[PDB]
Design a protein around this nucleic acid. Structure first.
Ligand SMILES: [Mg+2]
Ligand SMILES: [Mg+2]
Ligand SMILES: [Zn+2]
Ligand SMILES: [Zn+2]
Ligand SMILES: [Zn+2]
Ligand SMILES: [Zn+2]
Lengths: 162, 162
DNA sequence: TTGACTCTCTTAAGAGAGTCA
DNA sequence: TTGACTCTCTTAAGAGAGTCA
């Protein structure tokens, strides 16, 4: 529908509005015991959120723009990638939040990849702890670590061998 | 079912039956460019699956036992952990399959942990690649890798900073 | 053309429970 | 009692679309 020039305008207006969001400084683990800093542009907790934004879920938002009387809407974190392929290896591309802070809409904190790749970053050791992602992580995953396993592999008899 | 003796009975009969499932060898990446061998006891693809087992989904099964005329039924992979706490830090404990082979029911390939710890193993580098899970992984997660990102963080203008 | 809500869907790791014979 | 199916739910990363003034 929209021309590439029109999509650019949509991206530009998106950046301009998100850019005025409260910018919050966050200190985060980078892995290897190092500490870093991230600056998230956070969408408000309740309405109003900003021109073109509306909440469709607890931590889900959409961006709306009307062009030539026809309404267009996109996931709030997807706008930055409107000109990129929308799938790879037969998998749908998703906005992968590098800062692991949902309300953040800083485009420098997002990448475009499959859901499996997206999820995996929750456990990455970080850019300074051994991250191997081609598009490097910005910080260590919130869920990385020893874990909290209640019980490990076990058997009562001798019917099994590893 | 309810008493200690009864639960141990459920576990013992479960191991007995599963102990007769065909044993299939699988060679897997351990990380660090090394490779290992696992022995999975795989439940059949079609009925009959074995005494007490029934398929409730493509890759989901349930174990069923009648104790004192009352029918009890659990998730096929949960039986080994019947005596363990069913939650940790307020999170439901789940049968975490270390061998990443759903049909396998070898208790030596299972642990009891949060769904989050469970999922995270898909991206673990492995026992020889830097795994830090308290209850060590048996192999490198199938999803570990550089990923396939279509587009990284980017901005059109100059309103943002990392 | 817009803002503020509403509701249901996707994935892939995991589950509970009913209908028949 | 035991076997073989059927249908829906949970979680936490992510989505599309309708109503109304
Ligand atoms: Mg993410
Ligand atoms: Mg698993
Ligand atoms: Zn951020
Ligand atoms: Zn990473
Ligand atoms: Zn196995
Ligand atoms: Zn591990």
């Amino acid at each position: 529908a929209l021309t590439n020039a029109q999509i650019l305008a949509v991206i530009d207006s998106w950046e301009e509005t998100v850019g005025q969001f409260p910018v919050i400084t966050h200190h985060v683990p980078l892995g290897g015991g190092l500490q870093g800093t991230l600056h998230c542009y956070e969408i408000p907790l309740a309405a109003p959120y900003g021109v073109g934004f509306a909440k469709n879920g607890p931590t889900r938002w959409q961006y709306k723009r009307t062009i030539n009387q026809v309404v267009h809407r996109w996931g709030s974190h997807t706008v930055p990638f409107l000109l990129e392929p929308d799938n790879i290896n037969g998998k749908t591309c998703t906005a992968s939040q590098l800062c692991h802070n949902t309300r953040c809409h800083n485009p420098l904190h997002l990448c475009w990849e499959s859901l499996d790749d997206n999820k995996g970053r929750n456990w990455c050791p970080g850019p300074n702890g051994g991250c191997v992602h081609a598009v490097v992580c910005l910080r260590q995953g919130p869920l990385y670590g020893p874990g909290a396993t209640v019980a490990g592999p076990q058997q009562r008899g001798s019917h099994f061998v590893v």
